[PDB]
Design a protein around this ligand. Structure first.
Ligand SMILES: [Mg+2]
Ligand SMILES: [Mg+2]
Ligand SMILES: [Mg+2]
Ligand SMILES: [Mg+2]
Ligand SMILES: [Mg+2]
Ligand SMILES: [Mg+2]
Ligand SMILES: [Mg+2]
Ligand SMILES: [Mg+2]
Ligand SMILES: [Mg+2]
Ligand SMILES: [Mg+2]
Ligand SMILES: [Mg+2]
Ligand SMILES: [Mg+2]
Ligand SMILES: [Mg+2]
Ligand SMILES: [Mg+2]
Ligand SMILES: [Mg+2]
Ligand SMILES: [Mg+2]
Ligand SMILES: [Mg+2]
Ligand SMILES: [Mg+2]
Ligand SMILES: [Mg+2]
Ligand SMILES: [Mg+2]
Ligand SMILES: [Mg+2]
Ligand SMILES: [Mg+2]
Ligand SMILES: [Mg+2]
Ligand SMILES: [Mg+2]
Ligand SMILES: [Mg+2]
Ligand SMILES: [Mg+2]
Ligand SMILES: [Mg+2]
Ligand SMILES: [Mg+2]
Ligand SMILES: [Mg+2]
Ligand SMILES: [Mg+2]
Ligand SMILES: [Mg+2]
Ligand SMILES: [Mg+2]
Ligand SMILES: [Mg+2]
Ligand SMILES: [Mg+2]
Ligand SMILES: [Mg+2]
Ligand SMILES: [Mg+2]
Ligand SMILES: [Mg+2]
Ligand SMILES: [Mg+2]
Ligand SMILES: [Mg+2]
Ligand SMILES: [Mg+2]
Ligand SMILES: [Mg+2]
Ligand SMILES: [Mg+2]
Ligand SMILES: [Mg+2]
Ligand SMILES: [Mg+2]
Ligand SMILES: [Mg+2]
Ligand SMILES: [Mg+2]
Ligand SMILES: [Mg+2]
Ligand SMILES: [Mg+2]
Ligand SMILES: [Mg+2]
Ligand SMILES: [Mg+2]
Ligand SMILES: [Mg+2]
Ligand SMILES: [Mg+2]
Ligand SMILES: [Mg+2]
Ligand SMILES: [Mg+2]
Ligand SMILES: [Mg+2]
Ligand SMILES: [Mg+2]
Ligand SMILES: [Mg+2]
Ligand SMILES: [Mg+2]
Ligand SMILES: [Mg+2]
Ligand SMILES: [Mg+2]
Ligand SMILES: [Mg+2]
Ligand SMILES: [Mg+2]
Ligand SMILES: [Mg+2]
Ligand SMILES: [Mg+2]
Ligand SMILES: [Mg+2]
Ligand SMILES: [Mg+2]
Ligand SMILES: [Mg+2]
Ligand SMILES: [Mg+2]
Ligand SMILES: [Mg+2]
Ligand SMILES: [Mg+2]
Ligand SMILES: [Mg+2]
Ligand SMILES: [Mg+2]
Ligand SMILES: [Mg+2]
Ligand SMILES: [Mg+2]
Ligand SMILES: [Mg+2]
Ligand SMILES: [Mg+2]
Ligand SMILES: [Mg+2]
Ligand SMILES: [Mg+2]
Ligand SMILES: [Mg+2]
Ligand SMILES: [Mg+2]
Ligand SMILES: [Mg+2]
Ligand SMILES: [Mg+2]
Ligand SMILES: [Mg+2]
Ligand SMILES: [Mg+2]
Ligand SMILES: [Mg+2]
Ligand SMILES: [Mg+2]
Ligand SMILES: [Mg+2]
Ligand SMILES: [Mg+2]
Ligand SMILES: [Mg+2]
Ligand SMILES: [Mg+2]
Ligand SMILES: [Mg+2]
Ligand SMILES: [Mg+2]
Ligand SMILES: [Mg+2]
Ligand SMILES: [Mg+2]
Ligand SMILES: [Mg+2]
Ligand SMILES: [Mg+2]
Ligand SMILES: [Mg+2]
Ligand SMILES: [Mg+2]
Ligand SMILES: [Mg+2]
Ligand SMILES: [Mg+2]
Ligand SMILES: [Mg+2]
Ligand SMILES: [Mg+2]
Ligand SMILES: [Mg+2]
Ligand SMILES: [Mg+2]
Ligand SMILES: [Mg+2]
Ligand SMILES: [Mg+2]
Ligand SMILES: [Mg+2]
Ligand SMILES: [Mg+2]
Ligand SMILES: [Mg+2]
Ligand SMILES: [Mg+2]
Ligand SMILES: [Mg+2]
Ligand SMILES: [Mg+2]
Ligand SMILES: [Mg+2]
Ligand SMILES: [Mg+2]
Ligand SMILES: [Mg+2]
Ligand SMILES: [Mg+2]
Ligand SMILES: [Mg+2]
Ligand SMILES: [Mg+2]
Ligand SMILES: [Mg+2]
Ligand SMILES: [Mg+2]
Ligand SMILES: [Mg+2]
Ligand SMILES: [Mg+2]
Ligand SMILES: [Mg+2]
Ligand SMILES: [Mg+2]
Ligand SMILES: [Mg+2]
Ligand SMILES: [Mg+2]
Ligand SMILES: [Mg+2]
Ligand SMILES: [Mg+2]
Ligand SMILES: [Mg+2]
Ligand SMILES: [Mg+2]
Ligand SMILES: [Mg+2]
Ligand SMILES: [Mg+2]
Ligand SMILES: [Mg+2]
Ligand SMILES: [Mg+2]
Ligand SMILES: [Mg+2]
Ligand SMILES: [Mg+2]
Ligand SMILES: [Mg+2]
Ligand SMILES: [Mg+2]
Ligand SMILES: [Mg+2]
Ligand SMILES: [Mg+2]
Ligand SMILES: [Mg+2]
Ligand SMILES: [Mg+2]
Ligand SMILES: [Mg+2]
Ligand SMILES: [Mg+2]
Ligand SMILES: [Mg+2]
Ligand SMILES: [Mg+2]
Ligand SMILES: [Mg+2]
Ligand SMILES: [Mg+2]
Ligand SMILES: [Mg+2]
Ligand SMILES: [Mg+2]
Ligand SMILES: [Mg+2]
Ligand SMILES: [Mg+2]
Ligand SMILES: [Mg+2]
Ligand SMILES: [Mg+2]
Ligand SMILES: [Mg+2]
Ligand SMILES: [Mg+2]
Ligand SMILES: [Mg+2]
Ligand SMILES: [Mg+2]
Ligand SMILES: [Mg+2]
Ligand SMILES: [Mg+2]
Ligand SMILES: [Mg+2]
Ligand SMILES: [Mg+2]
Ligand SMILES: [Mg+2]
Ligand SMILES: [Mg+2]
Ligand SMILES: [Mg+2]
Ligand SMILES: [Mg+2]
Ligand SMILES: [Mg+2]
Ligand SMILES: [Mg+2]
Ligand SMILES: [Mg+2]
Ligand SMILES: [Mg+2]
Ligand SMILES: [Mg+2]
Ligand SMILES: [Mg+2]
Ligand SMILES: [Mg+2]
Ligand SMILES: [Mg+2]
Ligand SMILES: [Mg+2]
Ligand SMILES: [Mg+2]
Ligand SMILES: [Mg+2]
Ligand SMILES: [Mg+2]
Ligand SMILES: [Mg+2]
Ligand SMILES: [Mg+2]
Ligand SMILES: [Mg+2]
Ligand SMILES: [Mg+2]
Ligand SMILES: [Mg+2]
Ligand SMILES: [Mg+2]
Ligand SMILES: [Mg+2]
Ligand SMILES: [Mg+2]
Ligand SMILES: [Mg+2]
Ligand SMILES: [Mg+2]
Ligand SMILES: [Mg+2]
Ligand SMILES: [Mg+2]
Ligand SMILES: [Mg+2]
Ligand SMILES: [Mg+2]
Ligand SMILES: [Mg+2]
Ligand SMILES: [Mg+2]
Ligand SMILES: [Mg+2]
Ligand SMILES: [Mg+2]
Ligand SMILES: [Mg+2]
Ligand SMILES: [Mg+2]
Ligand SMILES: [Mg+2]
Ligand SMILES: [Mg+2]
Ligand SMILES: [Mg+2]
Ligand SMILES: [Mg+2]
Ligand SMILES: [Mg+2]
Ligand SMILES: [Mg+2]
Ligand SMILES: [Mg+2]
Ligand SMILES: [Mg+2]
Ligand SMILES: [Mg+2]
Ligand SMILES: [Mg+2]
Ligand SMILES: [Mg+2]
Ligand SMILES: [Mg+2]
Ligand SMILES: [Mg+2]
Ligand SMILES: [Mg+2]
Ligand SMILES: [Mg+2]
Ligand SMILES: [Mg+2]
Ligand SMILES: [Mg+2]
Ligand SMILES: [Mg+2]
Ligand SMILES: [Mg+2]
Ligand SMILES: [Mg+2]
Ligand SMILES: [Mg+2]
Ligand SMILES: [Mg+2]
Ligand SMILES: [Mg+2]
Ligand SMILES: [Mg+2]
Ligand SMILES: [Mg+2]
Ligand SMILES: [Mg+2]
Ligand SMILES: [Mg+2]
Ligand SMILES: [Mg+2]
Ligand SMILES: [Mg+2]
Ligand SMILES: [Zn+2]
Lengths: 116, 59, 118, 48, 112
RNA sequence: GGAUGACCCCAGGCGGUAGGGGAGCGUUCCCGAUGCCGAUGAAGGCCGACCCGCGAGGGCGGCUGGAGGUAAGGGAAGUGCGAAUGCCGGCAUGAGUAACGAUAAAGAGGGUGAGAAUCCCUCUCGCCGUAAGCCCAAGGGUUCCUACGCAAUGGUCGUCAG
RNA sequence: GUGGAGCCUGGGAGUGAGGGCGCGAGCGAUAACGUCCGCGUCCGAGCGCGGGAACAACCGAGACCGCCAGCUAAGGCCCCC
RNA sequence: GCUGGGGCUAGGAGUGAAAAGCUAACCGAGCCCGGAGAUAGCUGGUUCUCCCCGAAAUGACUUUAGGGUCAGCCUCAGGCG
RNA sequence: CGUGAGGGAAAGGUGAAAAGAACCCCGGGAGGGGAGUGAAAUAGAGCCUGAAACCGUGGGCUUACAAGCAGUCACGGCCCC
RNA sequence: AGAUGGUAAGGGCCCACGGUGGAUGCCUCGGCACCCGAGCCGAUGAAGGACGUGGCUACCUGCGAUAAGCCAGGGGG
């Protein structure tokens, strides 16, 4: 029996191109160029899936810092105080507190200052 | 010469950008005051044959 | 450059260009009205006007002058005897040019009529 | 310039012609070969 | 109600006719007519016919009034190309593509 | 642990080129098939943000299509392509660009016709004239002459034409 | 010392152009991103991640997948950051 | 001297006032078909997926040095413990 | 294609049935629009299915102080569900 | 003094719908392989052709100036 390509390859190319929707020029229109693009994309996702955790933590730290200097201390000092006080609310919530619940954040600054 | 050549295929975007100046300008026309038909100005009206008020031409 | 130069070249060398105006003159003077391209038309005016002015003179000299371009005694007789008198009082402007409204199909050339005046 | 095909009817027939092919063991093999292939012409067309 | 005409296999190259078509898209049947008449292009001849026939269709088949017709849509499509040989120097042969247009004019009625 | 592959718990390993090994997906075909799915719609095609699978894939749904397809479990191979200045074809880019093939040359009037710079006629102009005229022989093979045509051929047009 | 240790018999290989760096020599000129050996390392194959402005082999560290959680390494904490 | 027509000489052969010129638009050995799928230690190319391990670029010999044979290093199975 | 020996292609499919579209309309014609046939006509002869590159028309979002292997991660605006 | 919007000559992504093109599936008047059967023709002019041959006939097929065919036997309806 002879097993010609037949239907199979077209189906694989369709798979790829559908993933390449939205891409520029031949990157969304040509299987070859699409595939190349998609490799790049895949590694970027992985790498950026990682840096997202970095990208946010850096943001929180910048925000907490700003709210700290409003009460007359810096981020480094603040965090040491919390450590000394045994407060373990993370920087995700610390920032949300720093914006939405400034009184509560103020109290945390008190505790921090006392723990030094 | 040494036979210059396109280095890369021009993209659909770039060839069409080049043609952003390629549209035809419509013919400028005015009514012929005799027969009200539309014709280019400063030409003898090809419908009634009048120009400058008089019959000039057998149409 | 072309600073203050008078005379179209009409994409012809010296002798062809000369021949061109002459043949036009023969045809204008013959049929009273011809159709050409606008540029030849505008350029034909003065060439013919001059010839009509000489006809307005009438002398043997001016006849022999016109013959240099027109070359046809009968055509010139028509020029001197029938044409020139119509212009006895007219001071130049023995010709007019009016542009037609449609171009040639095969090459898109804009057309004009050139006629002798009333 | 003078090119390579310089048509001559006598030259043609005398060189590739049917009788020329038959005179020689090789040419008869030519005819054999072209017939087995089913060629419509065993021999170059010519007019006289 | 709409009326369409199509000229298939017109022996002109699409990129060229389209230029002419672009002039009349969205125009009133009356303006389109005038435009085409004094457009200095080969394409104008072909377009005019498709436009004229579509106008005919509307009046004659679709109960639409001539004095209200306007070019609702118009477009040129590539038809099959006629491939021809163009002999070049040094024994090389090129291939000219004498191209083809499918010209479509679609008329609607400007009401009121 | 339970009874031996059911599943659960605890622990540890799990970057990877040449390469070794394991487990799977899908394609053509055969048994399964005198069967079963099928016009209340086969295969193929086009969508899907839904479901299953680590994945290759498998479903299901809608549109198309209009006559085929074949399960569980096995069998056999022309069995998976992105590259070979690969092969065949199709279509792009360069681009409305270079060019339209001797710089002997053209102009107007009048016909014809749906349509004319290009076909016919007239007049004017130019070129060849030991030729770019005439007559033979090779070679070509109906190209000759009329009528009727303009899709293609004609480097544009075409009413004309080898 | 229970380790993707080790030994024995077989099946399948691939490799037989390495390279940078550190240390010990020869060659060179106490030259070379030089050459040639020795021990080690890394790249090769970790052009995956952090630092070094950027940079295969320098420093930090061996990436099974996910997290808008925490602690560190080298390196940093005036603004870009 | 040039030129038409009719002829003859060819592939390791012709022909050459000699240039290895020419022998049907590439002649230090024509073209076609066959031997033929020559041979090519060279260059290129080698197509689904997941999981585990994971090298070498050294030694010896080699008309050998960009190829090999054996050894070293990788992998799998069984055995030992 | 080659003087020749010799080389040597491409090119299948309307429909069950021609019922292969009378007649009218625009047009020189080609082509199309109605009418008609058919279960079906984007099965209409340039005919089963009709993918892809490629070309175009319409709509949504977007772009004329901006730096790029064209992606990816985040947030926001707009359109749709 | 400050700040923020509607521009699109044209371009980009997405959706729809077409054009071009002829992949895919289905189909087969064709081929392929094995097996079996069968196996020479020609001067009584072969093989293979050329030119002809129809009321109207380009090509193919058939046939040979008795020319898509003439005579006779058999089949068939
Ligand atoms: Mg296959
Ligand atoms: Mg294949
Ligand atoms: Mg896509
Ligand atoms: Mg996008
Ligand atoms: Mg792109
Ligand atoms: Mg990837
Ligand atoms: Mg991650
Ligand atoms: Mg996180
Ligand atoms: Mg982290
Ligand atoms: Mg701490
Ligand atoms: Mg903390
Ligand atoms: Mg608030
Ligand atoms: Mg030069
Ligand atoms: Mg280009
Ligand atoms: Mg490209
Ligand atoms: Mg490009
Ligand atoms: Mg460009
Ligand atoms: Mg575009
Ligand atoms: Mg451009
Ligand atoms: Mg007036
Ligand atoms: Mg000058
Ligand atoms: Mg002046
Ligand atoms: Mg001037
Ligand atoms: Mg002036
Ligand atoms: Mg002058
Ligand atoms: Mg001027
Ligand atoms: Mg010039
Ligand atoms: Mg010039
Ligand atoms: Mg010029
Ligand atoms: Mg000239
Ligand atoms: Mg002169
Ligand atoms: Mg007259
Ligand atoms: Mg003067
Ligand atoms: Mg003079
Ligand atoms: Mg004169
Ligand atoms: Mg004018
Ligand atoms: Mg004008
Ligand atoms: Mg023309
Ligand atoms: Mg000579
Ligand atoms: Mg030739
Ligand atoms: Mg000769
Ligand atoms: Mg002869
Ligand atoms: Mg001879
Ligand atoms: Mg002979
Ligand atoms: Mg014999
Ligand atoms: Mg012979
Ligand atoms: Mg034959
Ligand atoms: Mg022969
Ligand atoms: Mg013969
Ligand atoms: Mg145009
Ligand atoms: Mg456009
Ligand atoms: Mg015009
Ligand atoms: Mg115009
Ligand atoms: Mg009408
Ligand atoms: Mg040329
Ligand atoms: Mg040539
Ligand atoms: Mg090309
Ligand atoms: Mg072309
Ligand atoms: Mg075309
Ligand atoms: Mg685990
Ligand atoms: Mg492991
Ligand atoms: Mg691994
Ligand atoms: Mg294994
Ligand atoms: Mg498959
Ligand atoms: Mg299947
Ligand atoms: Mg049933
Ligand atoms: Mg259905
Ligand atoms: Mg249906
Ligand atoms: Mg199938
Ligand atoms: Mg999926
Ligand atoms: Mg699927
Ligand atoms: Mg489905
Ligand atoms: Mg389906
Ligand atoms: Mg059936
Ligand atoms: Mg199936
Ligand atoms: Mg079985
Ligand atoms: Mg199976
Ligand atoms: Mg096999
Ligand atoms: Mg194969
Ligand atoms: Mg590959
Ligand atoms: Mg390829
Ligand atoms: Mg190339
Ligand atoms: Mg190749
Ligand atoms: Mg190609
Ligand atoms: Mg092109
Ligand atoms: Mg231009
Ligand atoms: Mg250019
Ligand atoms: Mg230019
Ligand atoms: Mg030019
Ligand atoms: Mg020419
Ligand atoms: Mg040329
Ligand atoms: Mg010329
Ligand atoms: Mg010229
Ligand atoms: Mg001269
Ligand atoms: Mg000229
Ligand atoms: Mg006329
Ligand atoms: Mg008339
Ligand atoms: Mg003409
Ligand atoms: Mg014409
Ligand atoms: Mg004329
Ligand atoms: Mg001409
Ligand atoms: Mg001419
Ligand atoms: Mg005259
Ligand atoms: Mg001379
Ligand atoms: Mg003489
Ligand atoms: Mg002479
Ligand atoms: Mg003669
Ligand atoms: Mg003769
Ligand atoms: Mg000939
Ligand atoms: Mg003929
Ligand atoms: Mg007669
Ligand atoms: Mg024609
Ligand atoms: Mg024509
Ligand atoms: Mg025509
Ligand atoms: Mg015809
Ligand atoms: Mg033409
Ligand atoms: Mg030509
Ligand atoms: Mg006619
Ligand atoms: Mg005629
Ligand atoms: Mg003739
Ligand atoms: Mg131990
Ligand atoms: Mg190990
Ligand atoms: Mg080990
Ligand atoms: Mg061992
Ligand atoms: Mg072993
Ligand atoms: Mg093996
Ligand atoms: Mg090796
Ligand atoms: Mg070696
Ligand atoms: Mg080396
Ligand atoms: Mg070495
Ligand atoms: Mg070494
Ligand atoms: Mg070495
Ligand atoms: Mg090493
Ligand atoms: Mg050192
Ligand atoms: Mg040290
Ligand atoms: Mg020293
Ligand atoms: Mg070194
Ligand atoms: Mg050194
Ligand atoms: Mg050294
Ligand atoms: Mg070295
Ligand atoms: Mg070492
Ligand atoms: Mg080392
Ligand atoms: Mg390597
Ligand atoms: Mg490594
Ligand atoms: Mg390592
Ligand atoms: Mg690294
Ligand atoms: Mg790099
Ligand atoms: Mg990096
Ligand atoms: Mg790094
Ligand atoms: Mg770095
Ligand atoms: Mg480096
Ligand atoms: Mg690990
Ligand atoms: Mg780990
Ligand atoms: Mg910390
Ligand atoms: Mg530190
Ligand atoms: Mg410091
Ligand atoms: Mg900072
Ligand atoms: Mg820094
Ligand atoms: Mg002689
Ligand atoms: Mg002779
Ligand atoms: Mg001779
Ligand atoms: Mg001879
Ligand atoms: Mg030889
Ligand atoms: Mg030989
Ligand atoms: Mg010899
Ligand atoms: Mg000699
Ligand atoms: Mg030859
Ligand atoms: Mg030669
Ligand atoms: Mg040789
Ligand atoms: Mg030769
Ligand atoms: Mg042979
Ligand atoms: Mg052999
Ligand atoms: Mg061979
Ligand atoms: Mg070979
Ligand atoms: Mg050998
Ligand atoms: Mg490992
Ligand atoms: Mg070595
Ligand atoms: Mg070694
Ligand atoms: Mg060597
Ligand atoms: Mg070797
Ligand atoms: Mg070996
Ligand atoms: Mg070994
Ligand atoms: Mg070992
Ligand atoms: Mg073992
Ligand atoms: Mg063990
Ligand atoms: Mg030939
Ligand atoms: Mg020939
Ligand atoms: Mg021939
Ligand atoms: Mg077909
Ligand atoms: Mg059927
Ligand atoms: Mg049928
Ligand atoms: Mg009509
Ligand atoms: Mg009519
Ligand atoms: Mg006609
Ligand atoms: Mg019709
Ligand atoms: Mg119709
Ligand atoms: Mg019906
Ligand atoms: Mg019905
Ligand atoms: Mg039904
Ligand atoms: Mg219907
Ligand atoms: Mg229809
Ligand atoms: Mg359909
Ligand atoms: Mg259908
Ligand atoms: Mg069917
Ligand atoms: Mg179709
Ligand atoms: Mg189609
Ligand atoms: Mg399509
Ligand atoms: Mg659009
Ligand atoms: Mg600025
Ligand atoms: Mg802006
Ligand atoms: Mg930008
Ligand atoms: Mg830029
Ligand atoms: Mg960049
Ligand atoms: Mg970005
Ligand atoms: Mg952020
Ligand atoms: Mg302001
Ligand atoms: Mg905007
Ligand atoms: Mg825009
Ligand atoms: Mg626009
Ligand atoms: Mg479509
Ligand atoms: Mg088609
Ligand atoms: Mg099948
Ligand atoms: Mg069969
Ligand atoms: Mg005998
Ligand atoms: Mg016979
Ligand atoms: Mg026959
Ligand atoms: Mg009987
Ligand atoms: Zn008027």
């Amino acid at each position: 029996p002879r097993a010609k390509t037949g239907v199979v390859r077209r189906r694989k190319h369709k798979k790829i191109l559908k993933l390449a929707k939205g891409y520029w020029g031949l990157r969304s229109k040509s299987f070859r160029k699409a595939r190349e693009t998609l490799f790049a994309a895949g590694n970027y996702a992985y790498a950026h899936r990682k840096r997202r955790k970095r990208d946010f933590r850096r943001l929180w730290i910048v925000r907490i810092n700003a709210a700290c200097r409003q009460h007359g201390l810096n981020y480094s000092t603040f965090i040491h105080g919390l450590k000394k006080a045994g407060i373990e609310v993370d920087r995700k919530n610390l920032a949300d507190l720093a914006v939405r619940e400034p009184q509560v954040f103020a109290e945390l600054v008190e505790r921090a200052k006392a723990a030094q | 010469a040494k036979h210059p050549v396109p280095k890369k295929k021009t993209s659909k975007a770039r060839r069409d950008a080049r043609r952003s100046h390629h549209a035809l300008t419509p013919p400028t026309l005015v009514p012929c005051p005799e027969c009200k038909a539309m014709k280019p100005p400063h030409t003898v009206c090809p419908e009634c044959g009048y120009y400058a008020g008089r019959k000039v031409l057998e149409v | 450059m072309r600073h203050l130069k008078s005379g179209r070249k009409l994409n012809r060398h010296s002798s062809h260009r000369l021949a061109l105006y002459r043949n036009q003159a023969k045809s204008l003077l013959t049929h009273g009205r011809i159709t050409t391209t606008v540029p030849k038309a505008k350029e034909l005016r003065g060439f013919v006007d001059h010839l009509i002015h000489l006809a307005k003179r009438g002398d043997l000299h001016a006849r022999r002058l016109v013959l240099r371009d027109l070359q046809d005694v009968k055509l010139v007789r028509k020029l001197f005897d029938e044409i020139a008198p119509r212009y006895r009082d007219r001071q130049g402007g023995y010709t007019r040019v009016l542009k037609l409204a449609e171009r040639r199909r095969g090459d898109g050339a804009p057309l004009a009529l050139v006629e002798l005046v009333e | 310039m003078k090119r390579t095909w310089q048509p001559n009817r006598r030259k043609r027939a005398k060189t590739h012609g049917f009788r020329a092919r038959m005179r020689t063991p090789g040419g008869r093999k030519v005819l054999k070969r072209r017939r087995q292939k089913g060629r419509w012409r065993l021999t170059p067309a010519v007019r006289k | 109600m709409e009326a369409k005409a199509i000229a298939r296999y017109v022996r002109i190259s699409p990129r060229k006719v389209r230029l002419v078509v672009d002039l009349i898209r969205g125009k009133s049947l009356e303006e389109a007519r005038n435009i085409l008449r004094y457009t200095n292009k080969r394409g104008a001849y072909f377009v005019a016919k498709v436009l004229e026939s579509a106008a005919a269709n509307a009046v004659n088949n679709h109960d639409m009034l001539e004095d209200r017709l306007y070019v609702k849509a118009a477009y040129v499509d590539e038809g099959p190309a006629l491939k021809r040989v163009l002999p070049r120097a040094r024994g090389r042969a090129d291939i000219i593509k004498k191209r083809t247009s499918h010209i479509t004019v679609i008329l609607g009625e400007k009401h009121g």
